[PDB]
Design an enzyme around this catalytic site. Structure first.
Site, PDB file in Angstrom:
ATOM      1  N   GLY A 125       0.867  -1.251   0.011  1.00 50.20           N
ATOM      2  CA  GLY A 125      -0.059   0.101  -0.092  1.00 50.20           C
ATOM      3  C   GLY A 125       0.776   1.179  -0.138  1.00 50.20           C
ATOM      4  N   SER A 126       0.507   2.247   0.883  1.00 48.93           N
ATOM      5  CA  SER A 126       0.975   3.704   0.805  1.00 48.93           C
ATOM      6  C   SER A 126       2.525   3.497   0.920  1.00 48.93           C
ATOM      7  CB  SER A 126       0.315   4.509   1.743  1.00 48.93           C
ATOM      8  OG  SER A 126       0.499   5.913   1.695  1.00 48.93           O
ATOM      9  N   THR A 127       3.227   2.582   1.656  1.00 53.18           N
ATOM     10  CA  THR A 127       4.617   2.574   2.006  1.00 53.18           C
ATOM     11  C   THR A 127       5.374   2.382   0.592  1.00 53.18           C
ATOM     12  OG1 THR A 127       4.675   0.221   2.305  1.00 53.18           O
ATOM     13  CG2 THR A 127       4.318   1.515   4.247  1.00 53.18           C
ATOM     14  N   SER A 130      -0.748  11.407   1.536  1.00 50.85           N
ATOM     15  CA  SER A 130      -0.739  10.010   0.973  1.00 50.85           C
ATOM     16  C   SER A 130      -1.851   9.951   0.061  1.00 50.85           C
ATOM     17  CB  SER A 130      -0.731   9.061   1.952  1.00 50.85           C
ATOM     18  OG  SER A 130      -0.309   7.631   1.427  1.00 50.85           O
ATOM     19  N   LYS A 166       6.930   6.630   6.164  1.00 51.45           N
ATOM     20  CA  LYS A 166       5.749   6.665   5.638  1.00 51.45           C
ATOM     21  C   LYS A 166       4.954   5.486   6.183  1.00 51.45           C
ATOM     22  CE  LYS A 166       2.455   7.602   2.377  1.00 51.45           C
ATOM     23  NZ  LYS A 166       1.265   7.181   3.378  1.00 51.45           N
TER      24      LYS A 166
END
Length: 478
Positions: A217-219, A273, A408
């Protein structure tokens, strides 16, 4: 068969992690034991075996010339049995492992089976090195891990505390030296005591950091941004309009976690994000540029560490990337990784864009490594991730007492052959990075944004202790 002394496993500073302990095995020639039956009950008792079960075994194996009576008594108990001086009763000197740090480094070190052969972890991965040669017996060789037991204890304690405090059952934490590729800590919960595997649940034995595969995901948005800044088409002061927090691409809708924005600069896209913002950049630069960065930093690639059942996950390729696949790659659902891969990828970014191979053994001569992201782009993205942690609306719970930190948060989606994980991935100090760390907390629901809330504080406490234990000069200056 004359058993060899198994090699000592230490941490990077020589602290013992796996030590060969002398034990005494007893075997018998039935037919010779048969000449001394009045001795059998005193022998049985000294073996901790039942009188009649013991006698049946001798009688029933009367046809054999060799049987084991008992494996791995203490040398004292062994002397006790031998001092009875019963006919037909012989001793072998064996070795059993002792794990001085027990559950604290269980998954990394692993353990030996009944035959003193590696079954899990480093014990299996370096079995030949450690085993030596049975008899002349040649003793096995000493092995110094990359693990710093002081960091390992800190990681184990803080991950365990956070999980207990927040009702979570399971999780992992990886610490890497960004310069050397060394794994300084790898802890999983739940864990088990390798010195006492009686009650041992298969759930406790899972090496989650190397085995659990998830959509990060966002990482991975920072790797999408790296590809953008390398494209020639984007600078940090560039603006993307993400209003109204959603973007329709044919039948699919991209939705942002926060939908309170119109114009964002590229830093703002990482702080908020925004999936819409990273998707619009991805459409402009093409999925292949993003795929190439993610492949080069090792996401969905073999780690080369040799842990049994370490997983590779998956970085799918396409000849043609439609819009939906381009967007889902760019915000982290188009691939699956392990926590070790994610930490390795953050290490490359932290090491001014230079990838160094993973090592679970102490690194004296650092490999050349590969410049996978330009130092200029790596530097720019490091500054953006410092703002993710430090800026208003950012991940303030990741802030590290006494230092500047960068990273993050994300919500990961479990992949199995769904359930969620709360992630925080980052590094410190922010301006001159030394350490990269990934915290994974397993979660039942997707909502809550628990990356910023439960994983980030573990990062804060563990990163603080790790930097101080390594004498890294604070970069929060007077």
């Amino acid at each position: 068969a004359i058993p060899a002394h198994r090699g000592l496993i230490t941490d990077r500073n020589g602290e013992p992690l796996a030590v060969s302990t002398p034990v005494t095995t007893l075997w018998a020639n039935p037919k010779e034991l048969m000449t001394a039956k009045e001795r059998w009950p005193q022998l049985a008792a000294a073996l901790g075996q039942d009188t009649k079960l013991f006698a049946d075994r001798i009688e029933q194996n009367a046809e054999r010339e060799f049987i084991y009576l008992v494996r791995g008594l203490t040398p004292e108990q062994g002397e006790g049995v031998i001092a009875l001086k019963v006919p037909g009763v012989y001793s072998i000197e064996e070795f059993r492992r002792f794990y001085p740090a027990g559950e604290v480094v269980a998954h990394a070190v692993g353990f030996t089976d009944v035959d003193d052969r590696g079954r899990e972890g480093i014990e299996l991965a370096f079995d030949e090195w450690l085993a030596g040669v049975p008899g002349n017996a040649k003793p096995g060789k000493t092995l110094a891990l990359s693990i710093d037991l002081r960091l390992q204890y800190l990681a184990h304690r803080e991950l365990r505390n956070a999980l207990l405090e927040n009702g979570a059952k399971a999780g992992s934490l990886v610490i890497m030296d960004v310069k050397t590729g060394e794994i300084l800590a790898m802890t999983n919960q739940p864990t088990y005591n390798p010195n006492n595997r009686r009650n041992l649940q298969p759930a406790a034995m899972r090496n989650r950091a190397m085995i659990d595969v998830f959509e990060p995901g966002s990482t991975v948005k920072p790797f999408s941004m790296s590809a953008a800044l390398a494209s020639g088409r984007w600078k940090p002061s560039d603006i993307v309009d993400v209003y109204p927090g959603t973007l329709q691409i044919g039948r699919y809708t991209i939705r942002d976690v926060s939908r309170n924005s119109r114009q964002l600069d590229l830093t703002g896209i990482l702080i908020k994000s925004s999936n819409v913002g990273i998707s619009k950049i991805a459409f402009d630069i093409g999925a292949e540029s993003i795929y190439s960065v993610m492949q080069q930093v090792g996401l969905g690639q073999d780690t080369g560490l040799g842990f049994p059942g370490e997983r590779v996950g998956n970085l799918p390729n396409h000849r043609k990337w439609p819009k939906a696949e381009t967007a889902t790659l760019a915000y982290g659902y188009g691939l699956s990784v392990t926590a070790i891969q994610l930490a390795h990828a953050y290490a490359a970014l932290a090491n001014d864009g230079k990838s160094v191979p993973l090592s679970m053994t102490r690194v004296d001569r650092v490999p050349d490594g590969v410049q996978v992201i330009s130092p200029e782009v790596a530097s720019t993205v490091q500054g953006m991730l410092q703002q993710v942690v430090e800026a208003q609306g950012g991940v303030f719970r990741a802030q590290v007492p006494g230092y500047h930190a960068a990273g993050k948060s994300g919500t990961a989606r479990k992949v199995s052959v769904n359930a969620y994980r709360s992630l925080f991935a980052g590094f410190a100090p922010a301006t001159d990075p030394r350490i990269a760390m990934v915290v994974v907390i397993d979660e039942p629901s997707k909502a809550g944004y628990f990356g910023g809330l439960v994983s980030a504080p573990v990062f804060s406490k563990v990163m603080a202790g790790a930097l101080r234990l390594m004498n890294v000069p604070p970069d929060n200056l007077p």
